[PDB]
């Protein structure tokens, strides 16, 4: 689960070479279907993703 | 030589002790409002591409 009520079971363990790699070499470790947003309207997860990426990038800690 | 009823009182006084109101200044908060989260100055990119 996330901190926004988006609970779900673990359905697969996707091999690390079959995951979509980014142009920076990275590779996600969680894949989250984008269809839980439209009906549940948890816009706080889409802001937490950006806040946490900015934190990890700048060494900061946002509130 | 006994006690008899006398004339009815003509008025009543009720005493109470009361202090007064000061000026309205309405000093809401030490550091007031919700101060906004903001940009650290300069920052700089902490990541580069390969090549």
PDB file of N, CA and C in Angstrom:
ATOM      1  N   UNK A   1       0.839  -1.186   0.000  1.00  0.00           N
ATOM      2  CA  UNK A   1       0.000   0.000   0.000  1.00  0.00           C
ATOM      3  C   UNK A   1       0.876   1.238   0.000  1.00  0.00           C
ATOM      4  N   UNK A   2       0.331   2.336  -0.507  1.00  0.00           N
ATOM      5  CA  UNK A   2       0.962   3.634  -0.378  1.00  0.00           C
ATOM      6  C   UNK A   2       0.351   4.369   0.812  1.00  0.00           C
ATOM      7  N   UNK A   3       0.797   5.600   1.041  1.00  0.00           N
ATOM      8  CA  UNK A   3       0.248   6.427   2.103  1.00  0.00           C
ATOM      9  C   UNK A   3      -1.007   7.169   1.668  1.00  0.00           C
ATOM     10  N   UNK A   4      -1.687   6.682   0.626  1.00  0.00           N
ATOM     11  CA  UNK A   4      -2.862   7.364   0.097  1.00  0.00           C
ATOM     12  C   UNK A   4      -4.021   6.409  -0.163  1.00  0.00           C
ATOM     13  N   UNK A   5      -4.021   5.233   0.458  1.00  0.00           N
ATOM     14  CA  UNK A   5      -5.135   4.318   0.319  1.00  0.00           C
ATOM     15  C   UNK A   5      -5.123   3.486  -0.939  1.00  0.00           C
ATOM     16  N   UNK A   6      -3.980   3.383  -1.608  1.00  0.00           N
ATOM     17  CA  UNK A   6      -3.865   2.597  -2.833  1.00  0.00           C
ATOM     18  C   UNK A   6      -3.258   1.231  -2.514  1.00  0.00           C
ATOM     19  N   UNK A   7      -4.087   0.366  -1.943  1.00  0.00           N
ATOM     20  CA  UNK A   7      -3.641  -0.978  -1.617  1.00  0.00           C
ATOM     21  C   UNK A   7      -3.792  -1.903  -2.815  1.00  0.00           C
ATOM     22  N   UNK A   8      -2.901  -2.881  -2.893  1.00  0.00           N
ATOM     23  CA  UNK A   8      -2.964  -3.862  -3.956  1.00  0.00           C
ATOM     24  C   UNK A   8      -2.023  -5.007  -3.675  1.00  0.00           C
ATOM     25  N   UNK A   9      -2.365  -6.162  -4.222  1.00  0.00           N
ATOM     26  CA  UNK A   9      -1.565  -7.357  -4.036  1.00  0.00           C
ATOM     27  C   UNK A   9      -0.390  -7.324  -4.999  1.00  0.00           C
ATOM     28  N   UNK A  10       0.608  -8.152  -4.712  1.00  0.00           N
ATOM     29  CA  UNK A  10       1.747  -8.301  -5.602  1.00  0.00           C
ATOM     30  C   UNK A  10       1.467  -9.430  -6.584  1.00  0.00           C
ATOM     31  N   UNK A  11       1.326  -9.095  -7.865  1.00  0.00           N
ATOM     32  CA  UNK A  11       0.892 -10.090  -8.842  1.00  0.00           C
ATOM     33  C   UNK A  11       2.035 -10.754  -9.587  1.00  0.00           C
ATOM     34  N   UNK A  12       3.124 -10.039  -9.841  1.00  0.00           N
ATOM     35  CA  UNK A  12       4.278 -10.601 -10.522  1.00  0.00           C
ATOM     36  C   UNK A  12       5.545 -10.076  -9.874  1.00  0.00           C
ATOM     37  N   UNK A  13       6.630 -10.802 -10.095  1.00  0.00           N
ATOM     38  CA  UNK A  13       7.980 -10.326  -9.827  1.00  0.00           C
ATOM     39  C   UNK A  13       8.661 -10.254 -11.188  1.00  0.00           C
ATOM     40  N   UNK A  14       8.645  -9.075 -11.783  1.00  0.00           N
ATOM     41  CA  UNK A  14       9.108  -8.919 -13.153  1.00  0.00           C
ATOM     42  C   UNK A  14      10.627  -9.005 -13.208  1.00  0.00           C
ATOM     43  N   UNK A  15      11.194  -9.878 -14.039  1.00  0.00           N
ATOM     44  CA  UNK A  15      12.652  -9.923 -14.180  1.00  0.00           C
ATOM     45  C   UNK A  15      13.240  -8.528 -14.331  1.00  0.00           C
ATOM     46  N   UNK A  16      14.478  -8.368 -13.869  1.00  0.00           N
ATOM     47  CA  UNK A  16      15.102  -7.053 -13.883  1.00  0.00           C
ATOM     48  C   UNK A  16      15.576  -6.650 -15.270  1.00  0.00           C
ATOM     49  N   UNK A  17      15.672  -7.593 -16.202  1.00  0.00           N
ATOM     50  CA  UNK A  17      16.063  -7.281 -17.568  1.00  0.00           C
ATOM     51  C   UNK A  17      14.872  -7.057 -18.487  1.00  0.00           C
ATOM     52  N   UNK A  18      13.660  -7.370 -18.034  1.00  0.00           N
ATOM     53  CA  UNK A  18      12.441  -7.099 -18.782  1.00  0.00           C
ATOM     54  C   UNK A  18      11.745  -5.821 -18.343  1.00  0.00           C
ATOM     55  N   UNK A  19      12.300  -5.098 -17.379  1.00  0.00           N
ATOM     56  CA  UNK A  19      11.706  -3.855 -16.924  1.00  0.00           C
ATOM     57  C   UNK A  19      12.095  -2.712 -17.856  1.00  0.00           C
ATOM     58  N   UNK A  20      11.206  -1.737 -18.044  1.00  0.00           N
ATOM     59  CA  UNK A  20      11.529  -0.602 -18.917  1.00  0.00           C
ATOM     60  C   UNK A  20      12.566   0.298 -18.264  1.00  0.00           C
ATOM     61  N   UNK A  21      13.756   0.347 -18.850  1.00  0.00           N
ATOM     62  CA  UNK A  21      14.825   1.167 -18.307  1.00  0.00           C
ATOM     63  C   UNK A  21      14.716   2.588 -18.834  1.00  0.00           C
ATOM     64  N   UNK A  22      15.114   3.537 -18.001  1.00  0.00           N
ATOM     65  CA  UNK A  22      15.038   4.946 -18.337  1.00  0.00           C
ATOM     66  C   UNK A  22      16.309   5.379 -19.057  1.00  0.00           C
ATOM     67  N   UNK A  23      16.281   6.600 -19.592  1.00  0.00           N
ATOM     68  CA  UNK A  23      17.432   7.102 -20.333  1.00  0.00           C
ATOM     69  C   UNK A  23      18.599   7.421 -19.412  1.00  0.00           C
ATOM     70  N   UNK A  24      18.394   7.327 -18.101  1.00  0.00           N
ATOM     71  CA  UNK A  24      19.452   7.543 -17.124  1.00  0.00           C
ATOM     72  C   UNK A  24      20.063   6.245 -16.621  1.00  0.00           C
ATOM     73  N   UNK A  25      19.655   5.104 -17.168  1.00  0.00           N
ATOM     74  CA  UNK A  25      20.130   3.816 -16.720  1.00  0.00           C
ATOM     75  C   UNK A  25      19.281   3.175 -15.647  1.00  0.00           C
ATOM     76  N   UNK A  26      18.429   3.945 -14.980  1.00  0.00           N
ATOM     77  CA  UNK A  26      17.644   3.424 -13.878  1.00  0.00           C
ATOM     78  C   UNK A  26      16.637   2.394 -14.375  1.00  0.00           C
ATOM     79  N   UNK A  27      15.963   1.759 -13.425  1.00  0.00           N
ATOM     80  CA  UNK A  27      14.933   0.769 -13.717  1.00  0.00           C
ATOM     81  C   UNK A  27      13.982   0.740 -12.528  1.00  0.00           C
ATOM     82  N   UNK A  28      12.697   1.024 -12.714  1.00  0.00           N
ATOM     83  CA  UNK A  28      11.780   1.036 -11.574  1.00  0.00           C
ATOM     84  C   UNK A  28      11.826  -0.280 -10.818  1.00  0.00           C
ATOM     85  N   UNK A  29      11.394  -0.226  -9.563  1.00  0.00           N
ATOM     86  CA  UNK A  29      11.206  -1.427  -8.771  1.00  0.00           C
ATOM     87  C   UNK A  29       9.764  -1.640  -8.350  1.00  0.00           C
ATOM     88  N   UNK A  30       8.877  -0.688  -8.630  1.00  0.00           N
ATOM     89  CA  UNK A  30       7.437  -0.873  -8.500  1.00  0.00           C
ATOM     90  C   UNK A  30       6.789  -0.394  -9.789  1.00  0.00           C
ATOM     91  N   UNK A  31       5.884  -1.200 -10.331  1.00  0.00           N
ATOM     92  CA  UNK A  31       5.061  -0.833 -11.476  1.00  0.00           C
ATOM     93  C   UNK A  31       3.618  -0.724 -11.008  1.00  0.00           C
ATOM     94  N   UNK A  32       3.037   0.456 -11.211  1.00  0.00           N
ATOM     95  CA  UNK A  32       1.723   0.830 -10.705  1.00  0.00           C
ATOM     96  C   UNK A  32       0.844   1.232 -11.884  1.00  0.00           C
ATOM     97  N   UNK A  33      -0.223   0.479 -12.112  1.00  0.00           N
ATOM     98  CA  UNK A  33      -1.094   0.738 -13.255  1.00  0.00           C
ATOM     99  C   UNK A  33      -1.707   2.128 -13.126  1.00  0.00           C
ATOM    100  N   UNK A  34      -1.729   2.931 -14.193  1.00  0.00           N
ATOM    101  CA  UNK A  34      -2.230   4.305 -14.082  1.00  0.00           C
ATOM    102  C   UNK A  34      -3.743   4.433 -14.050  1.00  0.00           C
ATOM    103  N   UNK A  35      -4.482   3.348 -13.854  1.00  0.00           N
ATOM    104  CA  UNK A  35      -5.936   3.403 -13.896  1.00  0.00           C
ATOM    105  C   UNK A  35      -6.571   3.461 -12.514  1.00  0.00           C
ATOM    106  N   UNK A  36      -5.776   3.430 -11.448  1.00  0.00           N
ATOM    107  CA  UNK A  36      -6.315   3.659 -10.123  1.00  0.00           C
ATOM    108  C   UNK A  36      -6.541   5.111  -9.766  1.00  0.00           C
ATOM    109  N   UNK A  37      -6.020   6.035 -10.564  1.00  0.00           N
ATOM    110  CA  UNK A  37      -6.168   7.465 -10.323  1.00  0.00           C
ATOM    111  C   UNK A  37      -7.524   8.007 -10.768  1.00  0.00           C
ATOM    112  N   UNK A  38      -8.020   7.642 -11.954  1.00  0.00           N
ATOM    113  CA  UNK A  38      -9.190   8.356 -12.495  1.00  0.00           C
ATOM    114  C   UNK A  38     -10.437   8.242 -11.640  1.00  0.00           C
ATOM    115  N   UNK A  39     -10.678   7.088 -11.023  1.00  0.00           N
ATOM    116  CA  UNK A  39     -11.878   6.903 -10.220  1.00  0.00           C
ATOM    117  C   UNK A  39     -11.652   7.155  -8.738  1.00  0.00           C
ATOM    118  N   UNK A  40     -10.408   7.063  -8.268  1.00  0.00           N
ATOM    119  CA  UNK A  40     -10.096   7.262  -6.861  1.00  0.00           C
ATOM    120  C   UNK A  40      -9.524   8.638  -6.558  1.00  0.00           C
ATOM    121  N   UNK A  41      -9.038   9.354  -7.570  1.00  0.00           N
ATOM    122  CA  UNK A  41      -8.692  10.767  -7.435  1.00  0.00           C
ATOM    123  C   UNK A  41      -7.682  11.001  -6.317  1.00  0.00           C
ATOM    124  N   UNK A  42      -6.710  10.102  -6.191  1.00  0.00           N
ATOM    125  CA  UNK A  42      -5.625  10.273  -5.229  1.00  0.00           C
ATOM    126  C   UNK A  42      -4.529  11.086  -5.903  1.00  0.00           C
ATOM    127  N   UNK A  43      -4.768  12.387  -6.057  1.00  0.00           N
ATOM    128  CA  UNK A  43      -3.771  13.271  -6.643  1.00  0.00           C
ATOM    129  C   UNK A  43      -2.595  13.511  -5.708  1.00  0.00           C
ATOM    130  N   UNK A  44      -2.653  13.010  -4.476  1.00  0.00           N
ATOM    131  CA  UNK A  44      -1.535  13.153  -3.569  1.00  0.00           C
ATOM    132  C   UNK A  44      -0.394  12.210  -3.868  1.00  0.00           C
ATOM    133  N   UNK A  45      -0.675  11.082  -4.522  1.00  0.00           N
ATOM    134  CA  UNK A  45       0.390  10.174  -4.926  1.00  0.00           C
ATOM    135  C   UNK A  45       1.214  10.765  -6.064  1.00  0.00           C
ATOM    136  N   UNK A  46       0.555  11.413  -7.024  1.00  0.00           N
ATOM    137  CA  UNK A  46       1.267  12.065  -8.112  1.00  0.00           C
ATOM    138  C   UNK A  46       2.103  13.241  -7.639  1.00  0.00           C
ATOM    139  N   UNK A  47       1.760  13.846  -6.506  1.00  0.00           N
ATOM    140  CA  UNK A  47       2.601  14.898  -5.952  1.00  0.00           C
ATOM    141  C   UNK A  47       3.700  14.318  -5.074  1.00  0.00           C
ATOM    142  N   UNK A  48       3.424  13.211  -4.382  1.00  0.00           N
ATOM    143  CA  UNK A  48       4.457  12.582  -3.572  1.00  0.00           C
ATOM    144  C   UNK A  48       5.567  12.016  -4.441  1.00  0.00           C
ATOM    145  N   UNK A  49       5.226  11.484  -5.615  1.00  0.00           N
ATOM    146  CA  UNK A  49       6.263  10.991  -6.518  1.00  0.00           C
ATOM    147  C   UNK A  49       7.241  12.100  -6.880  1.00  0.00           C
ATOM    148  N   UNK A  50       6.722  13.261  -7.281  1.00  0.00           N
ATOM    149  CA  UNK A  50       7.591  14.361  -7.679  1.00  0.00           C
ATOM    150  C   UNK A  50       8.349  14.932  -6.490  1.00  0.00           C
ATOM    151  N   UNK A  51       7.684  15.065  -5.339  1.00  0.00           N
ATOM    152  CA  UNK A  51       8.363  15.571  -4.155  1.00  0.00           C
ATOM    153  C   UNK A  51       9.497  14.650  -3.728  1.00  0.00           C
ATOM    154  N   UNK A  52       9.259  13.336  -3.713  1.00  0.00           N
ATOM    155  CA  UNK A  52      10.297  12.392  -3.356  1.00  0.00           C
ATOM    156  C   UNK A  52      11.418  12.285  -4.360  1.00  0.00           C
ATOM    157  N   UNK A  53      11.117  12.418  -5.652  1.00  0.00           N
ATOM    158  CA  UNK A  53      12.184  12.433  -6.645  1.00  0.00           C
ATOM    159  C   UNK A  53      13.042  13.681  -6.505  1.00  0.00           C
ATOM    160  N   UNK A  54      12.417  14.841  -6.304  1.00  0.00           N
ATOM    161  CA  UNK A  54      13.161  16.061  -6.031  1.00  0.00           C
ATOM    162  C   UNK A  54      13.990  15.969  -4.759  1.00  0.00           C
ATOM    163  N   UNK A  55      13.463  15.326  -3.717  1.00  0.00           N
ATOM    164  CA  UNK A  55      14.217  15.128  -2.485  1.00  0.00           C
ATOM    165  C   UNK A  55      15.438  14.251  -2.718  1.00  0.00           C
ATOM    166  N   UNK A  56      15.239  13.058  -3.280  1.00  0.00           N
ATOM    167  CA  UNK A  56      16.366  12.189  -3.588  1.00  0.00           C
ATOM    168  C   UNK A  56      17.391  12.855  -4.496  1.00  0.00           C
ATOM    169  N   UNK A  57      16.960  13.713  -5.421  1.00  0.00           N
ATOM    170  CA  UNK A  57      17.879  14.429  -6.295  1.00  0.00           C
ATOM    171  C   UNK A  57      18.680  15.507  -5.588  1.00  0.00           C
ATOM    172  N   UNK A  58      18.046  16.329  -4.755  1.00  0.00           N
ATOM    173  CA  UNK A  58      18.725  17.452  -4.129  1.00  0.00           C
ATOM    174  C   UNK A  58      19.218  17.162  -2.721  1.00  0.00           C
ATOM    175  N   UNK A  59      19.015  15.952  -2.210  1.00  0.00           N
ATOM    176  CA  UNK A  59      19.374  15.647  -0.845  1.00  0.00           C
ATOM    177  C   UNK A  59      18.539  16.350   0.198  1.00  0.00           C
ATOM    178  N   UNK A  60      17.382  16.878  -0.172  1.00  0.00           N
ATOM    179  CA  UNK A  60      16.524  17.652   0.709  1.00  0.00           C
ATOM    180  C   UNK A  60      15.531  16.734   1.412  1.00  0.00           C
ATOM    181  N   UNK A  61      14.561  17.357   2.069  1.00  0.00           N
ATOM    182  CA  UNK A  61      13.454  16.639   2.694  1.00  0.00           C
ATOM    183  C   UNK A  61      12.280  17.600   2.738  1.00  0.00           C
ATOM    184  N   UNK A  62      11.315  17.399   1.853  1.00  0.00           N
ATOM    185  CA  UNK A  62      10.165  18.277   1.728  1.00  0.00           C
ATOM    186  C   UNK A  62       9.065  17.835   2.682  1.00  0.00           C
ATOM    187  N   UNK A  63       8.214  18.786   3.048  1.00  0.00           N
ATOM    188  CA  UNK A  63       7.088  18.495   3.916  1.00  0.00           C
ATOM    189  C   UNK A  63       5.809  18.369   3.104  1.00  0.00           C
TER     190      UNK A  63
ATOM    191  N   UNK B   1     -42.291  48.180  72.898  1.00  0.00           N
ATOM    192  CA  UNK B   1     -40.845  48.034  72.917  1.00  0.00           C
ATOM    193  C   UNK B   1     -40.338  46.987  71.941  1.00  0.00           C
ATOM    194  N   UNK B   2     -41.227  46.427  71.190  1.00  0.00           N
ATOM    195  CA  UNK B   2     -40.836  45.452  70.185  1.00  0.00           C
ATOM    196  C   UNK B   2     -40.486  46.080  68.850  1.00  0.00           C
ATOM    197  N   UNK B   3     -40.115  45.205  67.865  1.00  0.00           N
ATOM    198  CA  UNK B   3     -39.802  45.603  66.497  1.00  0.00           C
ATOM    199  C   UNK B   3     -41.059  45.609  65.632  1.00  0.00           C
ATOM    200  N   UNK B   4     -41.239  46.694  64.873  1.00  0.00           N
ATOM    201  CA  UNK B   4     -42.444  46.840  64.008  1.00  0.00           C
ATOM    202  C   UNK B   4     -42.008  47.022  62.551  1.00  0.00           C
ATOM    203  N   UNK B   5     -42.873  46.686  61.593  1.00  0.00           N
ATOM    204  CA  UNK B   5     -42.522  46.927  60.170  1.00  0.00           C
ATOM    205  C   UNK B   5     -42.473  48.433  59.887  1.00  0.00           C
ATOM    206  N   UNK B   6     -41.449  48.901  59.164  1.00  0.00           N
ATOM    207  CA  UNK B   6     -41.276  50.358  58.943  1.00  0.00           C
ATOM    208  C   UNK B   6     -41.668  50.691  57.507  1.00  0.00           C
ATOM    209  N   UNK B   7     -41.308  51.880  56.996  1.00  0.00           N
ATOM    210  CA  UNK B   7     -41.817  52.177  55.660  1.00  0.00           C
ATOM    211  C   UNK B   7     -41.073  51.377  54.596  1.00  0.00           C
ATOM    212  N   UNK B   8     -41.760  51.030  53.593  1.00  0.00           N
ATOM    213  CA  UNK B   8     -41.174  50.291  52.478  1.00  0.00           C
ATOM    214  C   UNK B   8     -40.011  51.062  51.859  1.00  0.00           C
ATOM    215  N   UNK B   9     -38.973  50.353  51.550  1.00  0.00           N
ATOM    216  CA  UNK B   9     -37.876  51.046  50.869  1.00  0.00           C
ATOM    217  C   UNK B   9     -38.314  51.711  49.567  1.00  0.00           C
ATOM    218  N   UNK B  10     -37.731  52.845  49.231  1.00  0.00           N
ATOM    219  CA  UNK B  10     -38.077  53.621  48.047  1.00  0.00           C
ATOM    220  C   UNK B  10     -37.210  53.223  46.855  1.00  0.00           C
ATOM    221  N   UNK B  11     -36.098  52.536  47.134  1.00  0.00           N
ATOM    222  CA  UNK B  11     -35.196  52.119  46.075  1.00  0.00           C
ATOM    223  C   UNK B  11     -34.243  51.017  46.499  1.00  0.00           C
ATOM    224  N   UNK B  12     -33.636  50.397  45.511  1.00  0.00           N
ATOM    225  CA  UNK B  12     -32.637  49.359  45.745  1.00  0.00           C
ATOM    226  C   UNK B  12     -31.343  49.680  45.005  1.00  0.00           C
ATOM    227  N   UNK B  13     -30.232  49.465  45.671  1.00  0.00           N
ATOM    228  CA  UNK B  13     -28.912  49.555  45.059  1.00  0.00           C
ATOM    229  C   UNK B  13     -28.234  48.188  45.030  1.00  0.00           C
ATOM    230  N   UNK B  14     -27.794  47.743  43.857  1.00  0.00           N
ATOM    231  CA  UNK B  14     -27.038  46.477  43.742  1.00  0.00           C
ATOM    232  C   UNK B  14     -25.644  46.848  43.278  1.00  0.00           C
ATOM    233  N   UNK B  15     -24.635  46.498  44.051  1.00  0.00           N
ATOM    234  CA  UNK B  15     -23.224  46.768  43.802  1.00  0.00           C
ATOM    235  C   UNK B  15     -22.545  45.508  43.265  1.00  0.00           C
ATOM    236  N   UNK B  16     -21.678  45.706  42.277  1.00  0.00           N
ATOM    237  CA  UNK B  16     -20.842  44.601  41.766  1.00  0.00           C
ATOM    238  C   UNK B  16     -19.522  45.299  41.410  1.00  0.00           C
ATOM    239  N   UNK B  17     -18.398  44.584  41.335  1.00  0.00           N
ATOM    240  CA  UNK B  17     -17.082  45.182  40.985  1.00  0.00           C
ATOM    241  C   UNK B  17     -16.703  44.780  39.558  1.00  0.00           C
ATOM    242  N   UNK B  18     -16.512  45.745  38.654  1.00  0.00           N
ATOM    243  CA  UNK B  18     -16.226  45.396  37.248  1.00  0.00           C
ATOM    244  C   UNK B  18     -15.063  46.154  36.624  1.00  0.00           C
ATOM    245  N   UNK B  19     -14.124  45.486  35.916  1.00  0.00           N
ATOM    246  CA  UNK B  19     -13.042  46.158  35.190  1.00  0.00           C
ATOM    247  C   UNK B  19     -13.476  46.454  33.747  1.00  0.00           C
ATOM    248  N   UNK B  20     -12.656  47.140  32.932  1.00  0.00           N
ATOM    249  CA  UNK B  20     -13.059  47.616  31.571  1.00  0.00           C
ATOM    250  C   UNK B  20     -12.334  46.926  30.404  1.00  0.00           C
ATOM    251  N   UNK B  21     -12.767  47.167  29.152  1.00  0.00           N
ATOM    252  CA  UNK B  21     -12.210  46.626  27.920  1.00  0.00           C
ATOM    253  C   UNK B  21     -11.024  47.448  27.415  1.00  0.00           C
ATOM    254  N   UNK B  22      -9.966  46.783  26.903  1.00  0.00           N
ATOM    255  CA  UNK B  22      -8.880  47.516  26.233  1.00  0.00           C
ATOM    256  C   UNK B  22      -9.120  47.717  24.742  1.00  0.00           C
ATOM    257  N   UNK B  23      -8.136  48.285  24.052  1.00  0.00           N
ATOM    258  CA  UNK B  23      -8.260  48.543  22.611  1.00  0.00           C
ATOM    259  C   UNK B  23      -8.248  47.220  21.855  1.00  0.00           C
ATOM    260  N   UNK B  24      -8.956  47.105  20.719  1.00  0.00           N
ATOM    261  CA  UNK B  24      -8.814  45.907  19.878  1.00  0.00           C
ATOM    262  C   UNK B  24      -7.557  45.923  19.019  1.00  0.00           C
ATOM    263  N   UNK B  25      -6.591  45.062  19.339  1.00  0.00           N
ATOM    264  CA  UNK B  25      -5.374  44.938  18.545  1.00  0.00           C
ATOM    265  C   UNK B  25      -5.355  43.655  17.723  1.00  0.00           C
ATOM    266  N   UNK B  26      -5.924  42.577  18.255  1.00  0.00           N
ATOM    267  CA  UNK B  26      -6.100  41.324  17.531  1.00  0.00           C
ATOM    268  C   UNK B  26      -4.785  40.790  16.976  1.00  0.00           C
ATOM    269  N   UNK B  27      -3.785  40.492  17.868  1.00  0.00           N
ATOM    270  CA  UNK B  27      -2.444  40.062  17.462  1.00  0.00           C
ATOM    271  C   UNK B  27      -2.577  38.544  17.341  1.00  0.00           C
ATOM    272  N   UNK B  28      -2.920  38.090  16.146  1.00  0.00           N
ATOM    273  CA  UNK B  28      -3.241  36.667  15.896  1.00  0.00           C
ATOM    274  C   UNK B  28      -2.116  35.660  16.144  1.00  0.00           C
ATOM    275  N   UNK B  29      -0.894  35.890  15.659  1.00  0.00           N
ATOM    276  CA  UNK B  29       0.126  34.807  15.786  1.00  0.00           C
ATOM    277  C   UNK B  29       1.548  35.344  15.983  1.00  0.00           C
ATOM    278  N   UNK B  30       2.464  34.657  16.729  1.00  0.00           N
ATOM    279  CA  UNK B  30       3.878  35.082  16.827  1.00  0.00           C
ATOM    280  C   UNK B  30       4.428  35.156  15.400  1.00  0.00           C
ATOM    281  N   UNK B  31       4.765  34.006  14.810  1.00  0.00           N
ATOM    282  CA  UNK B  31       5.141  34.006  13.365  1.00  0.00           C
ATOM    283  C   UNK B  31       3.832  33.636  12.662  1.00  0.00           C
ATOM    284  N   UNK B  32       3.093  34.597  12.067  1.00  0.00           N
ATOM    285  CA  UNK B  32       1.751  34.336  11.524  1.00  0.00           C
ATOM    286  C   UNK B  32       1.549  33.738  10.129  1.00  0.00           C
ATOM    287  N   UNK B  33       0.339  33.224   9.860  1.00  0.00           N
ATOM    288  CA  UNK B  33      -0.026  32.680   8.527  1.00  0.00           C
ATOM    289  C   UNK B  33       0.604  31.296   8.344  1.00  0.00           C
ATOM    290  N   UNK B  34       0.378  30.652   7.196  1.00  0.00           N
ATOM    291  CA  UNK B  34       1.090  29.376   6.927  1.00  0.00           C
ATOM    292  C   UNK B  34       2.259  29.742   6.011  1.00  0.00           C
ATOM    293  N   UNK B  35       3.506  29.903   6.514  1.00  0.00           N
ATOM    294  CA  UNK B  35       4.605  30.360   5.662  1.00  0.00           C
ATOM    295  C   UNK B  35       4.861  29.319   4.569  1.00  0.00           C
ATOM    296  N   UNK B  36       4.996  29.745   3.299  1.00  0.00           N
ATOM    297  CA  UNK B  36       5.147  28.803   2.191  1.00  0.00           C
ATOM    298  C   UNK B  36       6.452  28.011   2.060  1.00  0.00           C
ATOM    299  N   UNK B  37       6.387  26.741   1.607  1.00  0.00           N
ATOM    300  CA  UNK B  37       7.594  25.946   1.344  1.00  0.00           C
ATOM    301  C   UNK B  37       8.272  26.585   0.127  1.00  0.00           C
ATOM    302  N   UNK B  38       9.607  26.538   0.034  1.00  0.00           N
ATOM    303  CA  UNK B  38      10.237  27.298  -1.084  1.00  0.00           C
ATOM    304  C   UNK B  38      11.571  26.761  -1.610  1.00  0.00           C
ATOM    305  N   UNK B  39      12.072  27.368  -2.691  1.00  0.00           N
ATOM    306  CA  UNK B  39      13.297  26.894  -3.407  1.00  0.00           C
ATOM    307  C   UNK B  39      14.615  27.106  -2.636  1.00  0.00           C
ATOM    308  N   UNK B  40      15.552  26.115  -2.531  1.00  0.00           N
ATOM    309  CA  UNK B  40      16.853  26.378  -1.925  1.00  0.00           C
ATOM    310  C   UNK B  40      17.631  27.145  -3.004  1.00  0.00           C
ATOM    311  N   UNK B  41      18.354  28.232  -2.666  1.00  0.00           N
ATOM    312  CA  UNK B  41      19.010  29.053  -3.691  1.00  0.00           C
ATOM    313  C   UNK B  41      20.068  28.332  -4.539  1.00  0.00           C
ATOM    314  N   UNK B  42      20.054  28.561  -5.858  1.00  0.00           N
ATOM    315  CA  UNK B  42      21.023  27.935  -6.785  1.00  0.00           C
ATOM    316  C   UNK B  42      20.760  26.457  -7.015  1.00  0.00           C
ATOM    317  N   UNK B  43      20.845  25.623  -5.969  1.00  0.00           N
ATOM    318  CA  UNK B  43      20.566  24.157  -6.046  1.00  0.00           C
ATOM    319  C   UNK B  43      21.575  23.432  -6.942  1.00  0.00           C
ATOM    320  N   UNK B  44      21.519  23.657  -8.263  1.00  0.00           N
ATOM    321  CA  UNK B  44      22.433  23.026  -9.263  1.00  0.00           C
ATOM    322  C   UNK B  44      21.921  21.625  -9.605  1.00  0.00           C
ATOM    323  N   UNK B  45      22.149  21.108 -10.829  1.00  0.00           N
ATOM    324  CA  UNK B  45      21.799  19.721 -11.138  1.00  0.00           C
ATOM    325  C   UNK B  45      22.708  18.774 -10.341  1.00  0.00           C
ATOM    326  N   UNK B  46      22.150  17.684  -9.803  1.00  0.00           N
ATOM    327  CA  UNK B  46      22.969  16.684  -9.065  1.00  0.00           C
ATOM    328  C   UNK B  46      22.967  15.382  -9.867  1.00  0.00           C
ATOM    329  N   UNK B  47      23.026  15.485 -11.198  1.00  0.00           N
ATOM    330  CA  UNK B  47      22.961  14.290 -12.084  1.00  0.00           C
ATOM    331  C   UNK B  47      23.343  14.690 -13.510  1.00  0.00           C
ATOM    332  N   UNK B  48      24.059  13.808 -14.211  1.00  0.00           N
ATOM    333  CA  UNK B  48      24.424  14.082 -15.624  1.00  0.00           C
ATOM    334  C   UNK B  48      24.200  12.839 -16.483  1.00  0.00           C
ATOM    335  N   UNK B  49      24.070  13.032 -17.795  1.00  0.00           N
ATOM    336  CA  UNK B  49      23.903  11.896 -18.729  1.00  0.00           C
ATOM    337  C   UNK B  49      25.239  11.193 -18.944  1.00  0.00           C
ATOM    338  N   UNK B  50      25.191  10.014 -19.560  1.00  0.00           N
ATOM    339  CA  UNK B  50      26.448   9.292 -19.866  1.00  0.00           C
ATOM    340  C   UNK B  50      26.895   9.576 -21.305  1.00  0.00           C
ATOM    341  N   UNK B  51      28.169   9.943 -21.479  1.00  0.00           N
ATOM    342  CA  UNK B  51      28.720  10.234 -22.818  1.00  0.00           C
ATOM    343  C   UNK B  51      29.083  11.700 -22.969  1.00  0.00           C
TER     344      UNK B  51
END
